[PDB]
C-alpha cells in the first residue's frame, strides 16, 4: 500500500502602518488611528514596517 | 460579540473597561520616573498611580471568586 | 397558553418577588464601583449588596431541594 | 417603596446615621487645610478627623462580615 | 477621551491646586539666589519657600497612604 | 389560635428562654457603639456580646439538625 | 458520529454550547507559563479556569439526573 | 517509566516555561554568599528569588484545581 | 539561555534608565581617595552618592510591591 | 465532488469626532459631548480622526 | 556525617562563604579593647562589625523565605 | 515484632529518613538556653526548628491521604 503526500506554499507580507498624535496651543489634541487619549501632550508619530 | 465569554469574563471586563487607560498610564509613568529617579513631582505621580493599580487588581480578583462560589453552591444542588 | 408553573416554581418565585429590586441594585453598584474602584463609600455599599445577594440565592436553592425530597418520598409509596 | 433593604443594609446604614455629619466634616477640614498646609491649628484638627473616619469605616466592614457568617452557617443546615 | 483619574489621584491633585504657584516660586527664588548667593534678603526668602515646599510634599504623601490603607482593609472583607 | 409546637420547637425554645435578654442587649450595644465608635469602653463590651450571640445561634441550629436525623432514621423502618 | 443516545445529545449540547473555551484555557496556560509574574496573564487565566470548572460540573450532573429518570421508568416494565 | 498523566503534563509546562531560573537562582546565591555586602548582588538576588517563589506557588495551585475537577466527575460514575 | 521575567524586567528598566551612574560613582570615589581635601571633588562625590542611594531605594520597593500584587491573585486560584 | 467558495469584501471609514470642556471664571463651566466638565482652566477640545 | 536538610545546606553556604569573618571579629574586638583610643583600630573594627551585621541578617531572611515556600506547597497535599 | 500496618510503614519511613533531627533539635535547645544571646546559637536553632516543623506537617498530611484512598475503596465492597 502506497501513500503519498505533497505540499507547496508561497507567502508574502510587505508594507507599512501608521498612527500618532499632536497637541496645539493647549487647546487641541489630535489623534490619528489611535484609540488612545494622546496622553503625552506632545507630538508623537509611530510608523510600523514589515517585509 | 467576542471570541467567547462566560458571565465571569464579563464581570472582569467591566473593571477592565471601567479604568479606561490606567494600564498604559502606569506603564509609561514608570518610563518617565526611571530616567530621572530623583524628581519629587515624578515620584508623587508614580505613587498615586501604583496605589490605584494595586487596588484595581485586588478587587478585580476578589469579585470573581465570590461569583464562582455562588455558582458552585447551586450546581451542587442539582444532584 | 399561559406558561405552566408548578408548586416548586411557585416556591422559587416567592423569593424573586420578595426581593423587589436587589437583582438590579447589585448591577448598578457594580457599574459604579467599576467606574471608580477606589472610593470607600462605593466599596462599603457594594460589600452589603453582594452579601445580601449571596444569602438570597443560597436560601432559595436549598429550599427547593427540600421540597423535591418530600414529593419524591411520597410518590415512592404508590406502588 | 424605598429601595429594598435587607438586614445587612439596615445594619450598615445604622453607622452612617450614627456619625451624623462626619462624612462632610472630613472633606471640609481637608479643603481648609489644603488651602494652607503649614498651619498647626489645621493640622491638629485634620489628624483627629481622619483618625475618626478610619476607625468608623473599619468597624463597619468587620461587623457586616460577622453578620454574614452567622447567617450562612444557619442556611447550610436546611438541607 | 478625558485622562482617566481615580479617587486617590484626585485627593493628590487637591494639594497641587491648593498651592497655586509655590511650585514655580520655589524655582524663581533659587534662580535669583544662585545669582547672588551672599545676599541676605534672598536667603531668608528662599528659606521660607523651601520650608513651605517640604511640608507640602510630606502632608501630601502621608494623606495618600492613609487613604490607601482604608480601602485595602475594606476590599479584603469581600471574600 | 396559639401556635402548635412540635418537639423541635421545644428544643429551640429552650435556647430562646435560656438567653433571657441577650437578644436585646446586642441591639442596645450596637446602637450606642454606632453613636460613638471611637470609645474603647463601648468596643470592649460589644465584642463580648456579639461573640456570645454567634455561639448561641450556632449551637441552636446544629442541635436541631441532629434530632431531625434521629427521627428520620426511626421513621424509615416502618416500611 | 456512528451512534448517539439521548444522553450523548445532552452532553453535546454543552460542548457545542461553549464555542472555543476548550482551547482558550489551553492557550492561556502556555502564555502564563511563559511569564508567571505578569498580572494581566494571571487575571486572564483565573477567569478561564473558573469558567472551565463550572462547565464540567454542570455537564456531569445533568447526565446523572437523566440516567436516574430512565432507570426508574425501565424498572416498572416488570 | 516515562509515564506522565495529565497532571504531570500540566506541571511540566511550568518547568519548561522557566528554562534556566532553576539554576540562575543558585548561581546568584553562591556569588552573593561570596560577598554579602554588595548592592548589585543584593538587587539581583531579590529579583530572582521572588520570581522563583511565584513560580512554585502557581505551579502547585494549578495542579490542585485540576484534581478537584477530576474527582467530581469520577464520583458520578455510580 | 537567558530567561527574564516581569520583575527583573522592572529592575532592568532602572538599570537602563541610569545610563552611567554605576560607573560615575565608582570613579568619583577614586578621585576623592586621591586627594580628600579638595572641596570640588567633595561636592561631586556628595552629589553622586546621594543619587545612587535614591536609585537603589526606589528600585527595591517597586519590585516588592509588584511581588505582593501577584501573590494576592495567585492566592485566589484555589 | 467539487466544492467551490468565492468571497469579496470592501470597507471604508473616514472622518472626525469632537468633544470638549470650557470654563469661564470659577463659577461657570460647560461640557460639550462629555459626561462632565474638565476641572480645568480655559478650554480644551479633542478631534479624534479616523481614515 | 550528621543529618542535614536543605535549609541547613542553605544556611551553611554563608558560613563557608564568609570564610573567617567570625574569627576576624573576635580578634579585632580583643586588640581594640586592649587600646580603645587608637583611631586606626577603631577604623578597622567598624568594617568588621558592619560586615557581621549584614551577614547574619541576609542569612536569616533567606531561610525564612525558603521555609514559607515549602509550607505553601505542603498545604496542598490535602 | 508487634503488628504494624501499611500506614505505619508509611509513617515510619519519615522517622527513619530523618535519622538524627529528632535529637539534634533537642540538643540545640539545651545549648541555646545556656546563653540565649549568642547569635551563633540562634542561627543554628532557627534552622533545626524550621526543619522539624516541615517534617511533622508532611508526615501527617501523607497519612491522611492514604486513609482516604482506602476508605473510598472499602466503601464499594457492598
Curated annotation (Swiss-Prot), chains A, J:
Q: Where in the cell is it found?
A: Cell outer membrane
Q: How does it assemble?
A: The core secretion machinery of the T3SS is composed of approximately 20 different proteins, including cytoplasmic components, a base, an export apparatus and a needle. This subunit is part of the base, which anchors the injectisome in the bacterial cell envelope. Forms a stable homooligomeric complex. The complex is composed of 15 subunits.
Residue ranges annotated as transmembrane are none
Question: What does this protein's UniProt record list under function?
Answer: Component of the type III secretion system (T3SS), also called injectisome, which is used to inject bacterial effector proteins into eukaryotic host cells. Forms a ring-shaped multimeric structure with an apparent central pore in the outer membrane.
Q: To which protein family does this belong?
A: Belongs to the bacterial secretin family. T3SS SctC subfamily.
- What protein name applies here? SPI-1 type 3 secretion system secretin
Protein origin, superkingdom: Bacteria
Q: Which residues of the full protein are shown?
A: 308 to 358 of 562
Q: Disruption effect? A: Insertion mutants are hypoinvasive in the HEp-2 cell assay.
Curated annotation (Swiss-Prot), chains G, H, I, K, L:
Keywords, alphabetical: Protein transport, Secreted, Transport, Virulence
- Where is this chain primarily localised? secreted
Mutating residue 56 to A: what's the consequence?
Exhibits constitutive secretion of substrates. Retains the ability to display SipD/SctA at the tip of the needle filament
Can you quote a single GO CC term?
cell surface
- What are the GO BP annotations of this UniProt entry? protein secretion by the type III secretion system
Q: Changing residue 29 to A: reported impact?
A: Exhibits constitutive secretion of substrates. Does not display SipD/SctA at the tip of the needle filament. Is non-invasive. Can polymerize into filaments in vitro
Where in or outside the cell it occurs: the entry states:
Secreted; Cell surface
Cell cycle is among the record's keywords = no
Lineage: superkingdom: Bacteria
Effect of gene disruption? The null mutant strain is non-invasive.
Q: Secreted: is it a keyword of this entry?
A: yes
> What outcome is documented for mutating residue 47 to A in this protein?
Exhibits constitutive secretion of substrates. Retains the ability to display SipD/SctA at the tip of the needle filament
What further fact does the record state? The levels of PrgI/SctF are reduced in an invA/sctV mutant, probably due to protein instability, and are increased in an invJ/sctP mutant.
Instruction: Write out the similarity annotation.
Output: Belongs to the SctF family.
> What is the annotated quaternary arrangement, including any partners?
The core secretion machinery of the T3SS is composed of approximately 20 different proteins, including cytoplasmic components, a base, an export apparatus and a needle. This subunit polymerizes and forms the helical needle filament. Interacts with the needle tip protein SipD/SctA. Interacts with the needle adapter protein PrgJ/SctI, the secretin InvG/SctC and the minor export apparatus protein SpaP/SctR. In vitro, the needle protomer refolds spontaneously to extend the needle from the distal end.
Domain comment as written in the entry: Deletion of the last five residues prevents self-association and yields monomeric proteins that allow biophysical studies. Forms a right-handed helical assembly with roughly 11 subunits per two turns. The location of the negatively charged surfaces are radically different among the needle filament proteins PrgI, BsaL and MxiH. In PrgI, the major negatively charged surface is not on the 'face' but instead is on the 'side' of the two-helix bundle, and only residues from helix alpha1 contribute to this negative region.
This protein's name:
SPI-1 type 3 secretion system needle filament protein
Amino acid at each position: 500500500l502506497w501513500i503519498v503526500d505533497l505540499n507547496k506554499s508561497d507567502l508574502e507580507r510587505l508594507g507599512t502602518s501608521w498612527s500618532g498624535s499632536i497637541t496645539i496651543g493647549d487647546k487641541l489634541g489630535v489623534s490619528l488611528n489611535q484609540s488612545s487619549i494622546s496622553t503625552l501632550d506632545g507630538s508623537r508619530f509611530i510608523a510600523a514596517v514589515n517585509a | 460579540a467576542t471570541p467567547w465569554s462566560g458571565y465571569l469574563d464579563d464581570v472582569s471586563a467591566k473593571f477592565d473597561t471601567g479604568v479606561d487607560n490606567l494600564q498604559t498610564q502606569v506603564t509609561e509613568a514608570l518610563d518617565k520616573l526611571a530616567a530621572k529617579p530623583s524628581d519629587p513631582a515624578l515620584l508623587a505621580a508614580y505613587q498615586s498611580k501604583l496605589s490605584e493599580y494595586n487596588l484595581y487588581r485586588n478587587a478585580q480578583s476578589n469579585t470573581v471568586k465570590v461569583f464562582k462560589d455562588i455558582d458552585a453552591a447551586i450546581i451542587q444542588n442539582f444532584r
